[PDB]
Symmetry: D3
Subunit: 260 residues, 6 copies
């Protein structure tokens, strides 16, 4: 559809991966309400499509997302934070059932780093940079900059970034555990699509159950997380893909999953 701030298209072979690109190179991909709206619409369309198995959220080659639009929240009041339209539709990424890969190129600061952290996998470019400069403008992160970041890179580095606003390179993010792979700036998006393709080639119902169990590691205690994982594991046997997948292995052949 006609989008002013993003470009939604299905990339890769078999049209199984959905690429959501943020088109705003004049503001370094500023996350305004209009952009967030289009982003949520695209995510819903790809999540409600049987062909799409995974989504790849990317930006530009110079900056993935420079965070929220300060020009909009400048004059916001405290009362305008609780009972208003402003800043309420940011956590839609956390309610998606299909895997979402984050291709980060250039600056990913504030809302951008929060947007990437909300995604399952994060692929960063050789020149990518992450930071939480909220402290430099008199505010703190508001979408996971102090919760997901701390759990990923630890307290020592999280405290520094959040309290100093300094940037970390893609290498430090890889070494700290924030990102899983570093790819060239020219092939970052292609590598993310290739990864999404491999993920979409598996049983979607099982992929969702897996994502749910992995995400449950930050909301439960290990003892209960294990029991919840085993219950989801038991439930996999109710699907036909489980029988097909295991039967293919014993017969030494490729499995043909039907998403059921």
């Amino acid at each position: 559809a006609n989008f002013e701030y993003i470009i939604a298209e299905k990339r890769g072979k078999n049209n199984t991966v959905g690429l959501i690109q943020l088109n705003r190179p004049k503001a370094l991909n500023a996350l305004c309400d209009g952009l967030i709206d289009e982003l949520n619409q695209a995510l819903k369309t790809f999540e409600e499509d049987p062909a799409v198995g995974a989504i790849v959220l990317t930006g530009g080659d110079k900056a993935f997302a420079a965070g929220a639009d300060i020009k909009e929240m400048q004059n916001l009041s405290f009362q305008d934070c609780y009972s208003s339209k402003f800043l309420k539709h940011w956590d839609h990424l956390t309610q998606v059932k299909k895997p979402v890969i984050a291709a980060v190129n250039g600056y990913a600061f504030g809302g951008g780093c929060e947007l990437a952290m909300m995604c399952d996998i994060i692929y960063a470019g050789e020149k990518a940079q992450f930071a939480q400069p909220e402290i430099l403008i008199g505010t703190i992160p508001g979408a996971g900059g102090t919760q997901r970041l701390t759990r990923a890179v630890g307290k020592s580095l999280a405290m520094e970034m959040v309290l100093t606003g300094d940037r970390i390179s893609a290498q430090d993010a890889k070494q700290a555990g924030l990102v899983s792979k570093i790819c060239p700036v020219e092939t970052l998006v292609e590598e993310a699509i290739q990864c999404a393709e491999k993920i979409a080639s598996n049983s979607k119902i099982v992929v969702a159950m897996a994502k749910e169990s992995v995400n449950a590691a930050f909301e439960m205690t290990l003892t209960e997380g294990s029991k919840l994982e085993k219950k989801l594991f038991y439930s996999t046997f109710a699907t036909d893909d489980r029988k097909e997948g295991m039967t293919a292995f014993v017969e030494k052949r490729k499995a043909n999953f039907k998403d059921q």
Copy 2:
């Protein structure tokens, strides 16, 4: 007693280290019911042995453990998994009170990675590989593979492995946090025994309390985890080894612990 799938013996000076070697070079150490039953028996006898202070779990030079036998759970239905005696004796390692070290040589896939992740310390070989290919056969990890992994390597890398099934090298595991030390393939087992020897050289009662204190980090909040650690710290003053160890510091000599 006789064993068909494992080799159990005591190693190290004074025979203070119990070695459990998975012996099935034809199935890449497939974790079948027979192997798990013998593994639990080997863990039990070493647990009830007052001479053994630590246990070392190892496999083969090419494969540590390939996971559960897919040929056995192929025909299993949902009703069987929930209330039938097939997949119910995998979590005995979590109940072992003595420290356990996992000498991972070669493939540690699926149940193997979980088996190693359930131990306290994991020593990996130069050519060791870890993966969670459950998604490739139409299922998800069922022994905490999505809980302990996520807590160690992070959501980004854990999500990829669980959703893509791709392998990670020993170097990637050491940098993430899954394994602590990388050893040559020919010296892995001996170095793990040498580490177990150092552990067994301390008071077992205090070694058990310390092991329980570390495990509490994944089951309680940081506030309550510190209070529990405080009470366990106070409990050490009720043992003779505490007085002996501290007295062995003021007096410049070697401590002679008595496990009491």
Copy 3:
């Protein structure tokens, strides 16, 4: 004030950073009760000063802190713990609202490692070393040596250090996530003061909210932690520094925070 174990002074330009140096180059900065008292007093004075924005905790070039004085706790009984004046004023550093940076040079063992882990940021020297040798004296870490360590470096490395007492290098500490920056031995203290200055230049009220939100990651679930972050983010709009910081950005100028 006159101190016998520490040297409290305000370093850096404009006197915005408070430095607490443990001066005991004969027992490797053994954390005696008298030292802990002076340390708590210095922390209180800096925390109750409108000029100090951040604190830097450091020791000697050869040793940061060798842990609690075993000479004192040698003869303590089980009743003397749960019920006396012994080992009770250690966790005061956890209640300090202002950021604290740990400049670790040389040995940081036992209580010294826990003392460093209680801080928000840890800068380690090239020759610095961390360890938890409590197991060698018949005791276990009782001030967060297992809780804050396991959550940072992982179970495998934490279990090893706690059950073996081996020393990890500054490089390994950074790769695991315990420390954020590896600074030269001759410039460690200066770099830490510079970092503290960069933190003390931001809105103190916002810096406090940021620290508390990051600490919440270890006390709450990811869902509730995100909602607590939301309310804290909303509360920033009630301060004057929030508007000044954002207006300066829109106007492309420097922000002059008033700490309110």
Copy 4:
């Protein structure tokens, strides 16, 4: 609007209370998808309405709600539950930030008891009956019938109701703590509206913060829940109603809250 299964209207003086009634006497107010969709619409309309301060959910004199429509979920398969439009929009009532009072008359079984427990306050009639008969049809509660009930009436009584499917009288629910007030069958709705009017007479912002603080008790530990309550207590000081409410108290007059 044109509702086929509900009757939404603003009752009470000043139209500050929104009444949502379920009109399906021929099915004991069975919760079908159409009924739930209309229920969610009425909730959103009253939530966005600036005049409505509280909502009152009620049914018939003989049945509040007899649970979900079994005729619809009869042929549903396991795959249908994890997809395909089925059973997703039931928890919308928990996201309503405004207080909701449940006026229960007659049968409140299964989904009806869950819907009542989802509300903040529950007023039951002299003849009201609560039960969880899911077990009698080969299923279990799926919208909190095993979590909120257990937390209110205890494990002993919750187990009996869930495992046996027996009913409890309004007198039993009040003594157990499930309902707060027992009103006559002829004046249950009026008393519920009166309670809603009293709640809609104070600052809506403070009412929202209060409701969130109460729900916080079931999502965190007592230590963290107290700190959030304290932070919310600090936050309300930024509102004008806080100053007006207290000023009126000091001056012995009626406070005129402006909801800001």
Copy 5:
């Protein structure tokens, strides 16, 4: 089988309920090692029986259980308690998948109250009494006496019983939430068996899922409890009894469950 301290028999029509009666009227059913072992054996036998659907745990008319045998743990030591197993095998009731009903007649003190609290449902006689007199002998509860009690009766009453050792009447336990139904002394066992029969008539697989859902209300947060309950609810559709139960309702007939 041959039991010296208990009487295990299968009571009720169709032999679907297993009754475990503690036969020791000379020590008020003091829970000794031998008694606990026999109790565990009887539980295991009933749990591994395809006919028994529920278990009824009862004692004498004057005493259900007077707690652990002080004559055995008198000369015990801290070392013999932490490492050497002398007190374990008590939590065998927490691992039972089938519902267990506690018919409490007379004294239920210390271990007896803990034994009853570990069961799912508790039926108390008109003259039954509950207490935690551990404080009177210089000890505290050790089998969840403080955890399960505080979560049912409240902090005020729990604190009083634990710090004073006073007894509460069956009526008080009923109003507080520790007992669900008060039965006459001469009909307590029969009514308890009747309730067990009502539980032993539904799908065992679904009854187990329901019990596990209720037990989970004390191990995690509400938001996570709702998710697990919803997932377990979805899983019930993979069983045959679910379809049979719902089809019988639509057809207005009795359901014939087959435990699958």
Copy 6:
């Protein structure tokens, strides 16, 4: 002493119970900073006094405590609450390791209800009343009024009291779980002292462990709470009172505890 708002004295035989009375009949025992400062001092001296075993907190015959002084927080700013001295030192009552009983007579509103809930046991008079009218002045509870209340009386009643500011009778508090015993207005304090004396007749070190175990119910999961109870149960064997208490029981005599 020279107190101006309270009357602290040691009542009961042998002077083993410390009575703290709030003397302010002209303000319904308003909790101002001066009262709280003296209350903390009275709690400190009684906690350090080796003869006092329990404390009893009481008010007047007409009012226990009418909440914080509104006239002192009227002109407070959002920055003052977060940075200034105002509204601090209220949680000291929760840090008292010795048991504390709350004798509530008359009004217990706002801060008074929270102050009473902070104690371990609450004895209420026949005419006592509890309420949380904070909502009527444009504020919410700020000392656990929602956390501890909801966890005791339930969500249904807690929501009503917090959102309507309605008063509940002493009978309602007893049936809900807020108070444990109701006593005549003329003998409330005497019965409270008698209860405190009973608690003071047992081993203080064990009484402390017991209180710590009960408070643990509101900070951890049921699984972890049970394990901590066991460790505290094991730690009790290191005390001499444990041996004395059990030795007296088997010998049918009265135990002479030595507080160690």
